[PDB]
From a paper:
BoNTs specifically target neuromuscular junctions (NMJ), where the toxins are internalized into neuronal cells, cleave the soluble N-ethylmaleimide sensitive factor attachment protein receptors (SNAREs) complex, inhibit the release of neurotransmitter acetylcholine, and eventually paralyze the affected muscles. Structurally, BoNT consists of an N-terminal light chain (LC, ~50 kDa) that is a metalloprotease and a C-terminal heavy chain (HC, ~100 kDa). The latter could be further divided into two domains: the N-terminal portion (~50 kDa) is the translocation domain (HN) required for the LC to be released into the cytosol; the C-terminal part (HC) is the receptor-binding domain responsible for the highly specific binding and endocytosis of BoNT into motoneurons. Amino acid (AA) sequence alignments based on genome sequences of strain IBCA10-7060 showed that the HC of this toxin is most similar to that of BoNT/A1 (~84% identity), while its LC and HN share ~81% and ~64% identity to that of BoNT/F5, respectively.
We then determined the crystal structure of HCHA at 1.8 Å resolution. Dramatically different solubility in solution was observed between HCHA and HCA1, which was largely caused by variation of a single residue (HCA1-R1156 and HCHA-M1148). The third notable difference is that a 3/10-helix (residues S955-S957) linking β8 and β9 in HCA1 is unstructured in HCHA due to the deletion of two residues in this region. In HCHA this loop (residues E1218-K1226) swings ~45 degrees towards the center of the HCC subdomain compared to that of HCA1. Furthermore, while HCA1-R1294 forms three hydrogen bonds with C520, T521, and D539 of SV2C through its long, well-extended side-chain, these hydrogen bondings are likely missing on HCHA because HCA1-R1294 is replaced by a serine (HCHA-S1286).
Numbering used by the authors: 863 to 1260, 1269 to 1288
Amino acid sequence: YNCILNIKYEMDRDKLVDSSGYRSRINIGTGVKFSEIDKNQVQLSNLESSKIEVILNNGVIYNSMYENFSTSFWIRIPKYFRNINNEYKIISCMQNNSGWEVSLNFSNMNSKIIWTLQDTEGIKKTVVFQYTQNINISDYINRWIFVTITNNRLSNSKIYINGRLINEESISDLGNIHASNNIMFKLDGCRDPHRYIWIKYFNLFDKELNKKEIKDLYDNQSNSGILKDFWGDYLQYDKPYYMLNLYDPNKYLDVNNVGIRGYMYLKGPRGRIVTTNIYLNSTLYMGTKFIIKKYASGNKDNIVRNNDRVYINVVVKNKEYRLATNASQAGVEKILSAVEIPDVGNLSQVVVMKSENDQGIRNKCKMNLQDNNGNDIGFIGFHQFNNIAKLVASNWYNTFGCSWEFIPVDDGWGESSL
């Protein structure tokens, strides 16, 4: 990829380093916060100390009329709750009004990601990606987004999102671009004291990446063996999740009654949360919460991986129960129950966790229930029993809605968890 900068967490020295081979120095401010689950994820808040400065290896400093180059990174931007029309920088490689930079903005309910080039005569070119907050379920709001920006000095700058080309702008009218010796990762000019971003995997490439390269990069950095929650973070054990069923996003999961004679079902309406002319979204913190419990994961840590065997705890009136069924019950759709954990006995309760990767909304999960001999009982979804859509496990080779997302409470979403 002609990679000339690759910011990566290194376990041995417990530190962010440049692993490109060029050994650019990475200085971290005391205001930077790290995810304890994934040390590549760093949080930059609106504080002077919340910054990362890269001192570029002399050989990778950009000063050229013709050198093609690209950059990639992942970013997670909290919902905007207030207007600003206050464009603020987040990644800066500028000196004397020339170079490149990434900035963010929020206007007319659109969150914007902005790429700017500026030549040594002060002339600017920009390419923008934007997405609306006026939408029931967003692939983008407060979710990890993969950004790739490529620059061909003889033609266009292009912005790719999650491996897909979104926008292009001609940049052939720019002359010499003399960028900074340093790259500054920092909220610069942001007037909201409480704004922040999450970022990871920042890369620079000494070429214009092509379509295939970018899709491969996206796929390789997706960590596709690990399940994701709604926000795109690693799915985890022992963490309460609200459940989104993608079949009918306007409904939510509820428990009619606990016990092996009870059932769960699809209840509506989910409803919406609104701040007029700022956002209008489906309410996410609705319905029964699931907690994923370790059973047979080979691993030590709390991350849920493809084909992990787990138990699912179901929270009802602030008490935990176990998702289970008697597969011997009549019919191909096995109605699921929330049963008292000490009393689950010989009921089927082992769930195989699966990723679902297609070209629709990201971070989809499936759950395949098995009996205690490993035999498939079926994927967890719904079946219409006259008037009621009940939660069931059903073998597809023997009913609907077996695609799920797990939603934990997150400060960037802004529904109150009170």
